[PDB]
Amino acid sequence: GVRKGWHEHVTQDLRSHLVHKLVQAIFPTPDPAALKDRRMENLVAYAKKVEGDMYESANSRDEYYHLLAEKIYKIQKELEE
């Protein structure tokens, strides 16, 4: 049921943190105020879309974790490096 059952183990707090983690991994936020800049806001939006997409794909928190950390890896090791 719901988002493949596992949903109950990932509350909005954890979601928000993970979004933050993605954002930070993409662009290391100097201070929360930075989030107010459209440049950053776009990254925040993208991070939310990614996080949501992963959530709505993964059949387990484990898989979700893999995909999120994998995403972080790719964005640095694949993309820029």
């Binding site: 954890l14 993970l18 983690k21 991994a25 893999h66 950390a69 090791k77």
Partner: peptide, 28 residues
Amino acid sequence: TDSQKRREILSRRPSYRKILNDLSSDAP
């Protein structure tokens, strides 16, 4: 399949594991 590929290859590049660990340690 793509899962397996990415995981299998990235498991050969432990910075991925460091990121996993960091994600676990950082995110509740």
